[PDB]
Structures are given as structure tokens and as C-alpha cells.
């Protein structure tokens, strides 16, 4: 059987074009916002499995202290 691409139907019929004008709700969407608050913005920055497994659960503001934790991060 030929690997050549042959189309059974070459054209969209006129009726479905009429329908496409009538309803485009499936090719439109809602607005996807960036983080709307400082807290949510910081979360997105510091979220994800990677960042989570590599930082303390009680945040440490000083690198002197943060290292004490990250020091212990490979078995």
C-alpha cells in the first residue's frame, strides 16, 4: 500500500465555514495572569519541585545560615 499521501476530502464545505463564523469560543480563551501579588510572585519564583527540595522549610535570610542546610543536600 502506497506511502503516498492521498486526501479523500480536499475542501471544507461552505456550511462549516458558516459555522466557523458563528462560534469561535473554542479558539479563544481566558486571560492567563502573571502573579497578581508580591506573595504569589515570590511563590512562583521559589516554587517547583527543584527549588522546594533544595531550600529550608523555614526560610533563611542569611547565606551563612542557608549553607548549613544546603551543605547536606547529596546522599
Amino acid at each position: 500500500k502506497r506511502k503516498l499521501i492521498v486526501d479523500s476530502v480536499k475542501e471544507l464545505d461552505s456550511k462549516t465555514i458558516r459555522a466557523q463564523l458563528s462560534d469561535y469560543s473554542d479558539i479563544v480563551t481566558t486571560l492567563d495572569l502573571a502573579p497578581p501579588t508580591k506573595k504569589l510572585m515570590m511563590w512562583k519564583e521559589t516554587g517547583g519541585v527543584e527549588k522546594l527540595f533544595s531550600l529550608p522549610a523555614q526560610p533563611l535570610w542569611n547565606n551563612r545560615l542557608l549553607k548549613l542546610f544546603t551543605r547536606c543536600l547529596t546522599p
Binding site: 502506497r2 506511502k3 503516498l4 499521501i5 492521498v6 486526501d7 479523500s8 476530502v9 480536499k10 475542501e11 471544507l12 465555514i17 466557523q20 463564523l21 469561535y24 473554542d26 479558539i27 479563544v28 480563551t29 481566558t30 486571560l31 492567563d32 495572569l33 502573571a34 502573579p35 497578581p36 501579588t37 508580591k38 504569589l40 510572585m41 511563590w43 512562583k44 519564583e45 516554587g47 517547583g48 519541585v49 522546594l52 527540595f53 529550608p56 522549610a57 523555614q58 533563611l60 535570610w61 542569611n62 551563612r64 545560615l65 548549613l68 542546610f69 551543605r71 547536606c72 543536600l73 547529596t74 546522599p75
Partner: protein, 905 residues
Amino acid sequence: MLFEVVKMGSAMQSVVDDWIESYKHDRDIALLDLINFFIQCSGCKGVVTAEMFRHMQNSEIIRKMTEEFDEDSGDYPLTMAGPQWKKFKSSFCEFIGVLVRQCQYSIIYDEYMMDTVISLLTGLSDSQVRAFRHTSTLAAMKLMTALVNVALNLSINMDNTQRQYEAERNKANERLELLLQKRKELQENQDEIENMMNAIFKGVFVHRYRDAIAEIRAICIEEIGIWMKMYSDAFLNDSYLKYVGWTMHDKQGEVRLKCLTALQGLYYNKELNSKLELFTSRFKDRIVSMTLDKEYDVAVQAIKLLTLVLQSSEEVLTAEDCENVYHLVYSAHRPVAVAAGEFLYKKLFSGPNANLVKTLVFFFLESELHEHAAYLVDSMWDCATELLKDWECMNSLLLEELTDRQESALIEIMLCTIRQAAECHPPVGRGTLTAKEKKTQLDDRTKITELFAVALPQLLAKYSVDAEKVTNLLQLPQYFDLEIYTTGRLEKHLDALLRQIRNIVEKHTDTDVLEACSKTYHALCNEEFTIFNRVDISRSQLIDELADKFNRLLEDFLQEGEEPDEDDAYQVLSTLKRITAFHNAHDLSKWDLFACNYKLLKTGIENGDMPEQIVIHALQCTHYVILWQLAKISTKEDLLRLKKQMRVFCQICQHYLTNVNTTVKEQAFTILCDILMIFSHQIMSGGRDMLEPLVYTPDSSLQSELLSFILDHVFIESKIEALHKRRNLLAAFCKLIVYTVVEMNTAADIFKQYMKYYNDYGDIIKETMSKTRQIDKIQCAKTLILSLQQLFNEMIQENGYNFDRSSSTFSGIKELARRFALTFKTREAIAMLHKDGIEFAFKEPNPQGESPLNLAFLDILSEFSSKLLRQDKRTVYVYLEKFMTFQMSLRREVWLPLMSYRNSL
């Protein structure tokens, strides 16, 4: 050799001229060479011969060439990727255009050449063979565009010759006859060309812009865009615009993109058209809706078009149309944000800049979508870069003679411009350095530093009472090149800052404000700068005050005294908050405040009534006391005392882990998971001698205490708020797992939820599984089966031993079982998995009928036999027959799990 010359070649006009050369010699051999070119460009390997040419019609040729196509794959030249094929396509198109343009004065009107080519392309464009329909359509589209040029030239020639005629009708009769004759000949030429376009348009475009294949619809819409931009007088009317109007509603992004690119070409660079504005006003609604197209690439163009539409009129758009576009400045996607931002600029941005700065504040305040300016600002960064870096201006409005809602918003905006200028990247989610950019950066920092070193102390003074404003203003010094405090001879202002910061710390109890103060004092206390020593004194002095205040409060507070009431507590808490925040960022060991904190935590247990907020902050505070002492580690008299405090603090955190207060449980839990990791076995790992004495391994009791918490507080049934807290707690526990501070068998109670909580916790549980596979392939697969075991026993306790294997509960475990199988040393594991699943299946026997039981686990275990393995399958079966007997093997009727498991082995 045409096809090969166009792909392999040499200039296009060179081979066109060579072809025109041969067409003059012998039309027929040359046209045949042209026929074949179009065929072979479609990937076809057939050849049309002279005998076919002279005798067969196109329908018969095309059929013969479908037969002789001789393809290997479904590939054809216009769909294969790589640069050599991209170059082919453009060569293919250049040649057609250049062929027609080079024939437009003689050959093109010879009644032979074009009808042949058009007939063939019209037939091929009708073929069901896609390689023909696709290639020939592209050809015919380029062919048409070449003809629009010819028509345009003709029109120009017709106008010149007309002006020549009239100038002579004035003024002789012999030249007039020639100009009349010339004018007659050109009109014939126009009719002939319009025929050819009308053939191609109705024969190809009208059917093929509507093709089932999207790539072919896009081809057609691209060129109709080109004709209208090229010969607008003749093509820029509704009779051609309507096609682009309909196709804007196409179901594919690539098609919709071309409709918008086409229309953009009809505004940029040049205007203005009454017929275009009518169409646009007629399709305006559908255009603004495309600013939220499912495909972002389409959405950008939709806004960019709306920006062009703005230039011509602003009549067509409504307030609601524009307001919708404004929202997109807060879009997650930067190209949309920036495009929407340029729209915002041209619409509403036209003390020179003070009115533009005030303008931006009103816009930001009218936005009910964002409560901070980080993303509004980034969207404006490309176009209003001058307005946004006008810090001198912005600084003036806040000081020197409006409403306090506008003052906070201006402070907000100001801080965003500064951060994005200081650090050179967009805010998170907007990301994706050069020579000249670091220059602007360095320029930006020094301008910021020099201005705000002087202005910030005045700014804090004015707005100190407001928590939101102060938290913002305090982020500033973290963006200074601090050198400038020395070389700029600005130390008088630095002292003013340290004074205003100090006053804020003492009048504020809000957690964020104090975090800002602490984080700021840390930035200034960098010891790579001459300034350190000045600040260190003020730090060392502020805290002397806090510790002494704290000790005295804690004297009246611990005894009977009176009461201590709600008021005496807020006194302690407030002061404790200030101390805790600073101990995080700053080493305060020189004040031994473990004593004050321990006395405050142990007293909380005995009395049983200690306000939540004090307990929380003590727990935090002594966490930092411990951690800081561990930072400076010789002596060994200090080292033995560290374990003293540490062992004790873990016990306190363990007691508060069952505290009736929920946010208190959580606080105690997260600190615990932190210390356990810090004082884990890994403490000594980093070339450490003196860190082997401090190592802590939790009791089996505590290990279960930490799990009980997770099950209660992470696994049950705004709210994005609540979830973030729980993911954080879960990862705190999973770190203990993947770094083996806690037994891996605890993960069984976690792995079984990978499904039931797949959207809340899926990725965290998925990583815990991987970091245990990469750590120990065998015991991973062990606890991994113990998970399915634990789900199994839960079904039993809730229903008994009748299951109903068709049920949703049982089907659910089987589904989780399949996904566990895809997680597969390499094969000694699955061996070990089937062994325990078999051991468990025959764990408990049946008392009666017949002396079943737990046997249903094999239909779950059957989900893993798919994976491995022929040799090992024998080994598994051999291990299975140690459990099953002959009259077990032989009867088949309910005993179906066992048979099913056996077929797969």
C-alpha cells in the same frame, strides 16, 4: 534539468533567461521541460515525455504521474525540513515570479505558454495527491502575484500613453493614430491578463484557500494579502477582503496568523483607505477577541494590528475594546504584555514627565487585576524606558507639594522601575548581559544610589507611619552600589537612614515591615565596603536596646505578677517579633538569648496557656540561636553546649507538634524538618571532624510523630494560599526521605497518594519516587509494593473480603499499579517486587471454603508482570509454585486472579 538546477544551482534570472532562450528556439521542448519542473518539484520521480505531451490531456498525465510517483515515504519537497529545503522553496518561488516578469512584454501574450502552465497547475491543484495539490497551489499563487505586477505595470503604461494621447489631441494626426493604436493594443493586453488572473483565482484560489490541509489554506491567504498591498486600487475591496474576513475564523493558528499579517500590511507603513476601514469596523469585534486567541503568536499580531488601527482612526474602537487590551499588560506571556503595553502607550501617553508619571499611577490604580506593579512596569519597559527611569521626577512628587492611595502606588511603581533597572532581568515568568547593557546598568545604579542615598532618609521620615509604604521604601538600599556612600562623601545621609530604620523597628510590629528592616540592615552590613564598621555599631546598638527591653519584660511576665493579660502579652510579642526578625539575618549570639527563649517555651508547656504568636516566634527565635552557634564552628566547651541546647529544642518542638493550635503544630513541624536535615548524618560529610559529635537521628517515635502530622495535615479531602503551605510541609518530609534521615518505609503512606492527590501534590510525590529509584532501585520497588498493600487492606476494612473487583475502589488500585510499573539492579528489582506481592497474596489463609485468601492482590500484581522478564519469569513462577498447589492450579472458576497472573508469566 530544471528541478535539479533550482535546488542544486546560480542566479534565478540566469536560468529563466536560459529557459526563455530555449523557448524561442523550440517552444515545445521547452514547455515540456517546464511541465516536468512543476511535477518534479512535488517530489514526483516520474517523467512526462514528448509523446505524452503531444497526445494525453492533463487529467490523464496527472493519473500516469500518480502511478509513477515512485515514493519511499509520504514526504515531498515543501514539507521536508532543513535549510537546503528552505532554500529550495524560495528558489522555486523566485523562479516562477522571475519567469513571468521576464515574459510580460512578449511571450506572455502568445496564446501558448501561459494557458499550458495554468491548465496544468489548475489540474494538479485539483488532485487528491497532496504533494501535487500543495506544490501546484503554491506555484499558482506565486504565478498570480507575478501577474498582479504585470497588470500594475500595464495600468501605469496605459495611463502614460493616455496622457500622451491627450497632449496630442490638443496639438500630428499621424502620431495620434499610433497612440490610439497603442492604447488599443494595451487594452487588449489588460483583458488578456485579467482573464489569466480570473482563471487562476476561480480555478485555484477559490477552492484551495478552503483546503482540508491547513498549510495550503495559509499559502492562499498569504498571497491574497500580498495582492491587496501591492495593487490596492484593484484588489483592496470587499470582494477580496471577505476571504480574509472568513478565514480569521479558521480553526488553526497558522491560518489565523496570516489573516492578521495580511491586514497589518494594509496599514503599515502607509494609509488611508475608506474600503479598508469599513471592513475593519465590520470585523472589529472578532479582532479584539483575538487578543485572547488560544495561540499567543496570534494574540500578539491581533494587538499589533489594533495598534495600527489606532493610528488611522481611534473612531472604530470603544472604551470597552481598549479596556480589554489594557488588561493584557498583566498577561503571563511577555510578547503579549509588551505588545499590549505599546498599545497602552500610544493610547494614553502623549514637570515635563510628571503628568505621564501621574498618568501611570491612575492606570495602575484603575487596574483591579494586579495589586503590585512588577508586571505592569515590565510591559512598559521597552517603550516608556525614559519615563520609567525618571527617578528624580518620581522622587519629587512624593515630597515637595497627592492622595495617600496614589502615594503608595507611586512608591510601588518607583520600586519596580528601580529593581528592574538595578538587576537587569524581567520579573519571574517574564524571562526567557550584552556589552552596552551592563553600561546602562552601571549608569542606572549610580543614578539610583546618588539620588536615593539622600532622598530615602527623607522618604522614610515622611511615610514612616505607613507599613505598606515603608516595606517598599526599605527594599531600596539592596539596589545600591554602596561604594558611593564613601567616595561620594555621603556618610551624613547614611547615618540618617540608620536612624529612620531604627525608629521604624521600634514603632512597628507588622511582620513584613520588620523583615524589611532586618533584610536591609543586612545589605548595609556588607564587610567588603568601608561602610561596614559604621553600620555594625548601629546594629550592635539597636539590639542592645531590644535585648535589654526583652529581659525586663520577661521578668514581670513569668512570675504571678498580673495577670499576665492580653495586654502584657502583646508587649512581649511585639518586642519578641523585632528580635526574631533580626536574629534570622544577623548573628546575635553575643546576646545569649537561648536562655530567655527557652524560659519562654518551657514555661508555655507547663502553664498550657501561651498565646500562639509568642510560641511561634520563640520557636523561630531559638531555631536561629541554635543555627547561628552551629555557623561558628574549636572550641569544644562551646561544642558540647550546642548539642545540649539542640537535643532539648528538638524535644520542645516535639511537644508542640501535638499542640492543639494548628498554625503552631505547623510551625513546630517545619523547624523540626529543618534541624533534622541540618544535624543529619550529612553534617560531618563535608570534610568535618568536629561535626560527628552533633549528629542527630530521630527516635522511631518521632519518625512516626512526623508522619502522623503529614497524614492529618497534608492529606484531607484564598485556597491557593492553603495549598502552598501544605506542599511546603510535604517537601519538608520528603527531603528527610530522599536523604534518608527517615526510613524509606515511611514513604509507603505517601506513594499511595500519588494519584488521589495528583494535581495538588503529583510532582512532589513523583520526585520522591525518582530520588529513591536513583538512590536504591531495590527498596524503592519494595516500599512501592507496600503502598499497594496498604491501599488493599484499607479496602478490606471498609467493605470486607467480597471486594467486587469491578468496583471503583479496586479498579483504582490497579490503575495506580500500572503507573508504578512504568517506573522500571535494572531487573533484580521487578524480581523483588513480584516476590513480595506473592508473599503478601498468600499471607493469611482461609478457614472455610476452601482451606483464598488475600488472593485478589495478584490482579494488581499482574500489572507488573508486563515489564519483566522471560528468564526471570521462570524464576517468579518457581517462587509462585512454592505457595500454590496442584488442586489450586487445576480448578478454574473467583480463583481468576491467580490464573490471570499465570497467563502473563
